[PDB]
């Protein structure tokens, strides 16, 4: 039961629980990415650290969503967290591409919940999404895009040298 | 007259004046609640202090609304402030229930003004409401709900002991 | 590939990957426990905070295991993380019981990996387990047991009062 | 004579003296490696410094073993220290390979002494080895492996440029 729930639809409550699963799944993905780049046969620390910090951001995102769910009187429901899509992530370029795909899917999920909030006339939700999630995703996606462009420029015909340099001088 | 008013309907101007009266009425209510719990025959300081701090928050809310009304070129109009609904407020449980009812009515009023702002295409209003009022009401209502649950748990068959303990260890 | 792997069996590598899943599953469980006690209709902050800090410990445990897997030249493999066993966790007593059951299962898993390490003559593993996991589990299980005894003592015929007091004065 | 020796076999005493020779031999090897990279015609300072710091670690390892030998009532016996395997060490890649081979041989020696300690039921020995030597060797071997992977990536078709960059940006 709740004695506080007001203007908080069951449709929004469910979408929020699905978004928590997506953020947690994203955190798991980034955990796998991070550790992949710490393999002795991959050994790009800067990449490890970039992805591990993203794991932590996505976990924090889920936690903020859960706290908001309780603030509105909604009920957290957790599902299975699906294993990441790959067991090995190839090059930094391959990984950065996979990260951007992931983030775009999270952003589209937030866009979808915002739409549903407008359709439900729930301005607290739409406010919460904007401040804490939408702006963050846009900034993060721009940083990833910038990274991908710099990695692409560095491939050329010297791909090993380029992957080292990016790691040392960007991820730095 | 005003030389600044832009995109600010007479309907929003009136709703803002009604919301100022509701916040001020709420502040008055909480003043009465606070002093009730300072009666020698009630004597729960922690409760006094909880309600008096809410009186101050609601007054500040009204003041922020009034400042915003002038910022938009609207004209403050004050009405009679109706005396609080009760002269004595019973137990902490009764009081916390009355507070939650009050806050929910304020929240619904803010929701109503937001709706009217969307219908009027006034995004400054909808922004102002979100940041300074809607998030605050959700947090406050959750805290009140948490309090009510803890008070309810403490009643049991030892209601005096429970009311003391909550006051001492929560309101603390 | 690895150029470093030495004295590190495929059986230990797999058991380490299973233990990472168990620690992560435990972290997820504790996340669900934490948020349950932050429901407005449960509202025991101290319990929220106890379980959330355990979520963080178990995540750190998994991370340490993953770092060790790479240090030995083993390859992380992630599986589905199964949703926690319950969606609502009942009383603090019920929850503390569930936590102790969980921790005992983790401890038995560590015991099992240690046995396998002896059978494999892998003293680095057995060392790593002892310092970072076995001592920690024993201390944590003793704290949980102490908590359970104090909760049990407090039930009596005044269960609500007892649950409040434990939260306020132990979890404090 | 000794008035303190307890549970300390002559087989362990001899293995400890052989391990001291191996650590000292390793220290000598790293001294030769360090100075090779300070030749005017090699001139990679970062490599000099990496190997010289390893010379010092291995000397400290031997000293700790000797102190432990006396702590148990065993008697240090020193042998000839064989000259390093090469007089010139080729590229950083060649050197890092030789270092990893060396470290793996030290690790296997520690593994062998641990086995012998279990067979002798000497838990102090097995404890001493773990804390001060086994964990250190695993960390060092992982760092070397990481280095070798980065050097390999940098060779490509620009081996001089790659060797400079690694020295400047990793060994740094
Ligand atoms: Ir950092
Ligand atoms: Ir950082
Ligand atoms: Ir960082
Ligand atoms: Ir919106
Ligand atoms: Ir929020
Ligand atoms: Ir105060
Ligand atoms: Ir205060
Ligand atoms: Ir106060
Ligand atoms: Ir709006
Ligand atoms: Ir404003
Ligand atoms: Ir804390
Ligand atoms: Ir704490
Ligand atoms: Ir804490
Ligand atoms: Ir063991
Ligand atoms: Ir370890
Ligand atoms: Ir130095
Ligand atoms: Ir240094
Ligand atoms: Ir140094
Ligand atoms: Ir042993
Ligand atoms: Ir020792
Ligand atoms: Ir820089
Ligand atoms: Ir640097
Ligand atoms: Ir205390
Ligand atoms: Ir306190
Ligand atoms: Pd919005
Ligand atoms: Pd708005
Ligand atoms: Pd052990
Ligand atoms: Pd040992």
Swiss-Prot record, chains A, B, C, D:
Please give the residue positions where the record annotates the modification N-acetylserine. Answer: 1
One Pfam family of this chain: Ferritin
Q: What is its main location?
A: cytoplasm
**Iron as a keyword?**
yes
Q: Which GO terms describe its molecular function?
A: ferric iron binding; ferrous iron binding; iron ion binding
What residue spans carry the region label Catalytic site for iron oxidation?
53-60
Highest taxon, organism lineage? Eukaryota
Ferritin-like diiron domain sequence ranges? 6-155
Q: Where does Fe cation bind?
A: 53, 56-57, 60, 63
Has UniProt tagged this entry with the keyword Iron? yes
CC annotations in GO: autolysosome; autophagosome; cytoplasm; cytoplasmic vesicle; ferritin complex
Q: Where in the cell is it found?
A: Cytoplasmic vesicle, Autophagosome; Cytoplasm; Autolysosome
Question: Could you tell me the Gene Ontology terms of the biological process aspect for this record?
Answer: intracellular iron ion homeostasis; iron ion transport
Which keywords does this chain's UniProt record carry?
Acetylation, Cytoplasm, Cytoplasmic vesicle, Iron, Iron storage, Lysosome, Metal-binding
Task: Show the SUPFAM superfamilies listed in the entry.
Answer: Ferritin-like
Q: Could you give the subunit structure recorded for this chain? A: Oligomer of 24 subunits. There are two types of subunits: L (light) chain and H (heavy) chain. The major chain can be light or heavy, depending on the species and tissue type. The functional molecule forms a roughly spherical shell with a diameter of 12 nm and contains a central cavity into which the insoluble mineral iron core is deposited. Interacts with NCOA4.
Report the family membership. Belongs to the ferritin family.
Further facts: In horse spleen the light chain is the major chain.
> What function does the entry list?
Stores iron in a soluble, non-toxic, readily available form. Important for iron homeostasis. Iron is taken up in the ferrous form and deposited as ferric hydroxides after oxidation. Also plays a role in delivery of iron to cells. Mediates iron uptake in capsule cells of the developing kidney. Delivery to lysosomes by the cargo receptor NCOA4 for autophagic degradation and release or iron.
Name the record gives this protein: Ferritin light chain
């Amino acid at each position: 039961s709740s004695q506080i729930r007001q203007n908080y639809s069951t449709e929004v409550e469910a979408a929020v629980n699905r978004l928590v699963n997506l953020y947690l799944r994203a955190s798991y993905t980034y955990l796998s990415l991070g550790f992949y780049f710490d393999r002795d046969d991959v050994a790009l620390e800067g990449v490890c650290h970039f992805f591990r910090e993203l794991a932590e951001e996505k976990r924090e995102g889920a936690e903020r969503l859960l706290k908001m769910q309780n603030q509105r009187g909604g009920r957290a429901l957790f599902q299975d967290l699906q294993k990441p899509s790959q067991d090995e992530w190839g090059t930094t370029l391959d990984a950065m591409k996979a990260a951007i795909v992931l983030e775009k899917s999270l952003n589209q999920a937030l866009l979808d919940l915002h739409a549903l909030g407008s359709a439900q006339a729930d301005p607290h939700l739409c406010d919460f999404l904007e401040s804490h999630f939408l702006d963050e995703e846009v900034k993060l996606i721009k940083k990833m895009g910038d990274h991908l462009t710099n990695i692409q420029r560095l491939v050329g015909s010297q791909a090993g040298l380029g992957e080292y340099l990016f790691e040392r001088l960007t991820l730095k």
